[PDB]
Amino acid sequence: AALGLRNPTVLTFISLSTAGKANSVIGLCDDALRVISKQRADLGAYYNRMEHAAKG
Amino acid sequence: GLRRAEQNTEDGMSLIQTAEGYLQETHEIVQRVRVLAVQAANGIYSEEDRQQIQVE
């Protein structure tokens, strides 16, 4: 639901059973990757900071 | 007094020793900013990519 691949209210996920629908799933999965990449950026960001703090 | 004033100097250098110990990591992090600034100033990154650098 959070990544946009599911509706938080309707509770229906993306489907590929249509040629027209599949063209619109490429765009959604791109922004799905952006959120996952953004979250991993922060986890990596804290971990480097936590690494420095332990050394000090 | 000579024996005492030496111990005051004995821990006098200890105070300076610990003060420099904290500044060691402070120097390390600003270098970590320095290397990332080199990567960020390129001409191939997008706003989504450059903001992940800003995250750290």
Side-chain angles (χ1 to χ4, degrees), chain A residues 23-40:
Chain A
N23 179 86
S24 58
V25 177
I26 299 179
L28 291 182
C29 290
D30 292 1
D31 285 1
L33 289 177
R34 178 167 56 92
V35 184
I36 307 169
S37 175
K38 181 57 178 298
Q39 187 59 46
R40 285 172 55 179

Side-chain angles (χ1 to χ4, degrees), chain B residues 31-50:
Chain B
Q31 285 188 347
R32 180 60 172 175
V33 179
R34 169 59 156 75
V35 49
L36 293 172
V38 177
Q39 174 181 6
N42 207 18
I44 78 162
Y45 284 111
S46 58
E47 301 84 357
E48 290 76 4
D49 302 329
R50 289 190 179 92

Side-chain angles (χ1 to χ4, degrees), chain B residues 17-33:
Chain B
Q17 171 178 329
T18 311
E20 225 288 328
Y22 285 97
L23 282 178
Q24 171 65 21
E25 183 196 344
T26 297
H27 186 99
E28 291 189 3
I29 278 185
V30 187
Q31 285 188 347
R32 180 60 172 175
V33 179

Side-chain angles (χ1 to χ4, degrees), chain A residues 15-27:
Chain A
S15 181
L16 298 182
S17 59
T18 309
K21 288 206 292 284
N23 179 86
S24 58
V25 177
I26 299 179

